[PDB]
Design an enzyme around this catalytic site. Structure first.
Site, PDB file in Angstrom:
ATOM      1  N   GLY A  11       0.821  -1.241   0.000  1.00  0.00           N
ATOM      2  CA  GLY A  11       0.000   0.000   0.000  1.00  0.00           C
ATOM      3  C   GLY A  11       0.856   1.293   0.000  1.00  0.00           C
ATOM      4  N   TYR A  76      26.018   3.453   1.751  1.00  0.00           N
ATOM      5  CA  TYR A  76      26.194   2.196   0.986  1.00  0.00           C
ATOM      6  C   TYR A  76      25.613   1.015   1.692  1.00  0.00           C
ATOM      7  CZ  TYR A  76      28.991  -0.763  -2.002  1.00  0.00           C
ATOM      8  OH  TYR A  76      29.453  -1.719  -2.901  1.00  0.00           O
ATOM      9  N   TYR A 119      27.822  -1.627  -8.321  1.00  0.00           N
ATOM     10  CA  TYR A 119      26.932  -1.901  -9.455  1.00  0.00           C
ATOM     11  C   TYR A 119      27.611  -2.737 -10.545  1.00  0.00           C
ATOM     12  CZ  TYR A 119      23.737   1.811  -7.847  1.00  0.00           C
ATOM     13  OH  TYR A 119      22.867   2.618  -7.199  1.00  0.00           O
ATOM     14  N   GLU A 141       8.843  -4.644  -4.072  1.00  0.00           N
ATOM     15  CA  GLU A 141       8.085  -5.770  -3.451  1.00  0.00           C
ATOM     16  C   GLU A 141       8.717  -7.111  -3.785  1.00  0.00           C
ATOM     17  OE1 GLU A 141       4.773  -5.882  -1.728  1.00  0.00           O
ATOM     18  OE2 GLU A 141       4.962  -8.130  -1.872  1.00  0.00           O
ATOM     19  N   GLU A 173      20.321   5.567  -3.361  1.00  0.00           N
ATOM     20  CA  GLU A 173      20.368   6.632  -4.362  1.00  0.00           C
ATOM     21  C   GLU A 173      19.306   7.677  -4.162  1.00  0.00           C
ATOM     22  OE1 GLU A 173      23.099   6.920  -5.864  1.00  0.00           O
ATOM     23  OE2 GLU A 173      23.693   4.958  -6.751  1.00  0.00           O
ATOM     24  N   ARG A 176      20.558   9.893  -1.490  1.00  0.00           N
ATOM     25  CA  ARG A 176      21.653  10.756  -1.949  1.00  0.00           C
ATOM     26  C   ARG A 176      21.080  11.951  -2.811  1.00  0.00           C
ATOM     27  NH1 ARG A 176      24.511   5.403  -3.634  1.00  0.00           N
ATOM     28  NH2 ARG A 176      25.703   4.922  -1.673  1.00  0.00           N
ATOM     29  N   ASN A 191       1.940   3.603  -9.953  1.00  0.00           N
ATOM     30  CA  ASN A 191       2.171   2.160  -9.905  1.00  0.00           C
ATOM     31  C   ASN A 191       2.622   1.628 -11.263  1.00  0.00           C
ATOM     32  OD1 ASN A 191       2.387  -0.154  -8.318  1.00  0.00           O
ATOM     33  ND2 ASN A 191       0.320  -0.920  -8.981  1.00  0.00           N
ATOM     34  N   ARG A 192       3.637   2.284 -11.851  1.00  0.00           N
ATOM     35  CA  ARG A 192       4.153   1.921 -13.158  1.00  0.00           C
ATOM     36  C   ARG A 192       5.689   1.785 -13.026  1.00  0.00           C
ATOM     37  NH1 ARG A 192       0.537   2.411 -17.542  1.00  0.00           N
ATOM     38  NH2 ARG A 192      -1.522   1.566 -16.844  1.00  0.00           N
TER      39      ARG A 192
HETATM   40  N1  LIG Z   1      25.877  -2.162  -2.298  1.00  0.00           N
HETATM   41  C1  LIG Z   1      25.917  -0.920  -2.775  1.00  0.00           C
HETATM   42  N2  LIG Z   1      25.319   0.081  -2.087  1.00  0.00           N
HETATM   43  C2  LIG Z   1      25.362   1.281  -2.602  1.00  0.00           C
HETATM   44  O1  LIG Z   1      24.826   2.211  -1.950  1.00  0.00           O
HETATM   45  C3  LIG Z   1      25.920   1.565  -3.887  1.00  0.00           C
HETATM   46  N3  LIG Z   1      26.006   2.798  -4.396  1.00  0.00           N
HETATM   47  C4  LIG Z   1      26.611   2.929  -5.569  1.00  0.00           C
HETATM   48  C5  LIG Z   1      27.248   1.817  -6.223  1.00  0.00           C
HETATM   49  C6  LIG Z   1      28.003   2.049  -7.501  1.00  0.00           C
HETATM   50  O2  LIG Z   1      28.724   1.138  -7.920  1.00  0.00           O
HETATM   51  N4  LIG Z   1      28.071   3.276  -7.996  1.00  0.00           N
HETATM   52  C7  LIG Z   1      28.701   3.523  -9.290  1.00  0.00           C
HETATM   53  C8  LIG Z   1      29.730   4.645  -9.191  1.00  0.00           C
HETATM   54  O3  LIG Z   1      30.159   5.034 -10.261  1.00  0.00           O
HETATM   55  N5  LIG Z   1      30.045   5.081  -7.952  1.00  0.00           N
HETATM   56  C9  LIG Z   1      31.063   6.094  -7.641  1.00  0.00           C
HETATM   57  C10 LIG Z   1      30.351   7.164  -6.745  1.00  0.00           C
HETATM   58  C11 LIG Z   1      30.033   6.493  -5.367  1.00  0.00           C
HETATM   59  C12 LIG Z   1      28.807   5.911  -5.125  1.00  0.00           C
HETATM   60  C13 LIG Z   1      28.571   5.298  -3.886  1.00  0.00           C
HETATM   61  C14 LIG Z   1      29.491   5.263  -2.834  1.00  0.00           C
HETATM   62  C15 LIG Z   1      30.741   5.868  -3.072  1.00  0.00           C
HETATM   63  C16 LIG Z   1      30.977   6.426  -4.334  1.00  0.00           C
HETATM   64  C17 LIG Z   1      32.310   5.362  -7.190  1.00  0.00           C
HETATM   65  O4  LIG Z   1      32.273   4.040  -7.048  1.00  0.00           O
HETATM   66  O5  LIG Z   1      33.385   5.913  -6.969  1.00  0.00           O
HETATM   67  N6  LIG Z   1      27.130   0.588  -5.748  1.00  0.00           N
HETATM   68  C18 LIG Z   1      26.580   0.429  -4.537  1.00  0.00           C
HETATM   69  N7  LIG Z   1      26.357  -0.779  -4.003  1.00  0.00           N
END
Ligand SMILES: Nc1nc(=O)c2ncc(C(=O)NCC(=O)N[C@@H](Cc3ccccc3)C(=O)O)nc2[nH]1
Length: 263
Positions: A11, A76, A119, A141, A173, A176, A191-192
Site C-alpha cells: 500500500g 552504501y 553496481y 516488493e 540513491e 543521496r 504504480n508503473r
Molecule cells: N551495495 C551498494 N550500495 C550502494 O549504496 C551503492 N552505491 C553505488 C554503487 C556504484 O557502484 N556506484 C557507481 C559509481 O560510479 N560510484 C562512484 C560514486 C560512489 C557511489 C557510492 C558510494 C561511493 C561512491 C564510485 O564508485 O566511486 N554501488 C553500490 N552498491
C-alpha cells in the site's frame, strides 16, 4: 543499538515513501556539516563504531521482512539480514571487515559474499545493466521476497543481484539525490515500473565526482565542469553547485571545508 527505519511496499504511497526517505537522510546526517546548503555525510576518520550504521527494515505485501545495513559514511548497503541468516558484500578493506562484525550480531548464520557490492559486479551477476532493470514499488516488493528466500535456494544468484540493484537505487540513491527520490515517487504514484533513464544513471555514477567538485569549489564554482545527461541522453554541463541544490541531497565527505575566507 543502531537506528532502524521501517518502510513497506504494501500500500505504499508517495507520502509514505517520502516519509521513509526523509527519515533515512535524518539518520545519515548529523547537521555538523553543510556546504552550500548541501549536507555532508560523516567523515569515516575517527567515526566511532556505535555511530557507523543505520538499519532499514523492509517489509512487503507478501508479509516478509528483510533488514538492510547502510554505512553512514556513504549510504552504501553493506549487507542484509533475513530472519536467521545475514549476508555481507566483500569488504573493501580490513577496517570495514571489522566494522561489519558489529551488525546482526545474534544472527545464527553469517556469510560474507566473495564479491563486492558495486553496481558493475552486481550487473555482471544479474546479467543485466541498471538501464534494463525496472524500478518502482512492484520491483521493490519482488526484491524483498527475493532477498528473503536466498538462504533456502529459492532465489538464484542472478535474481538476488538484480534485487540488490533495485534496493540500492530505491533507498541509497534516493537518499543521496532528491532527483532520484522524485523519480521513484513518480513510479509509486502511478504504480508503473520503469528502468532508470540516463539522468538517473549519470547522477548515480557521478555522485563522488560531484561531491568532490562541490567541496573543492571556489565559492561554489567548479574548476572543471562535469557533464551529466538529461532524460533524453543529451549533455547537461554542471559548472556550479547552485544548479545541484534541488538535485543532490547529501554528499560523501571528500575534503575539509576551508576557513571561510570572508570579505
Ligand atoms: N551495495 C551498494 N550500495 C550502494 O549504496 C551503492 N552505491 C553505488 C554503487 C556504484 O557502484 N556506484 C557507481 C559509481 O560510479 N560510484 C562512484 C560514486 C560512489 C557511489 C557510492 C558510494 C561511493 C561512491 C564510485 O564508485 O566511486 N554501488 C553500490 N552498491
Amino acid at each position: 543499538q543502531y537506528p532502524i527505519i521501517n518502510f513497506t511496499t504494501a500500500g505504499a504511497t508517495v507520502q509514505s515513501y517520502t516519509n521513509f526517505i526523509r527519515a533515512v537522510r535524518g539518520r545519515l546526517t548529523t547537521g555538523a556539516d553543510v556546504r552550500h546548503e548541501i549536507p555532508v555525510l560523516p567523515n569515516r576518520v575517527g567515526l566511532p563504531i556505535n555511530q557507523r550504521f543505520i538499519l532499514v527494515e523492509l517489509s512487503n505485501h507478501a508479509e516478509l521482512s528483510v533488514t538492510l545495513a547502510l554505512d553512514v559514511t556513504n549510504a552504501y548497503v553493506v549487507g542484509y539480514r533475513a530472519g536467521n541468516s545475514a549476508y555481507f558484500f566483500h569488504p573493501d578493506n580490513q577496517e570495514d571487515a571489522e566494522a561489519i562484525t558489529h551488525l546482526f550480531t545474534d544472527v545464527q548464520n553469517r556469510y560474507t559474499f566473495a564479491f563486492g557490492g558495486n553496481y558493475d559486479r552486481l550487473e555482471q551477476l544479474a546479467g543485466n545493466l541498471r538501464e534494463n532493470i525496472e524500478l518502482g514499488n512492484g520491483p521493490l516488493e519482488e526484491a524483498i521476497s527475493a532477498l528473503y528466500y536466498y538462504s533456502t535456494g529459492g532465489t538464484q544468484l542472478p535474481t538476488l543481484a538484480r534485487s540488490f540493484i533495485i534496493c540500492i537505487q530505491m533507498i541509497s540513491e534516493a537518499a543521496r539525490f532528491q532527483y532520484i527520490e522524485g523519480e521513484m515517487r513518480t513510479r509509486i504514484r502511478y504504480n508503473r515500473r520503469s528502468a532508470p533513464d540516463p539522468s538517473v544513471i549519470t547522477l548515480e555514477n557521478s555522485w563522488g565526482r560531484l561531491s568532490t567538485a562541490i567541496q573543492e569549489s571556489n565559492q561554489g564554482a567548479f574548476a572543471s565542469p562535469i557533464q551529466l545527461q538529461r532524460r533524453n541522453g543529451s549533455k547537461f554541463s554542471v559548472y556550479d553547485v547552485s544548479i545541484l541544490i534541488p538535485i543532490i541531497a547529501l554528499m560523501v565527505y571528500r575534503c575539509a571545508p576551508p576557513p571561510s575566507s570572508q570579505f
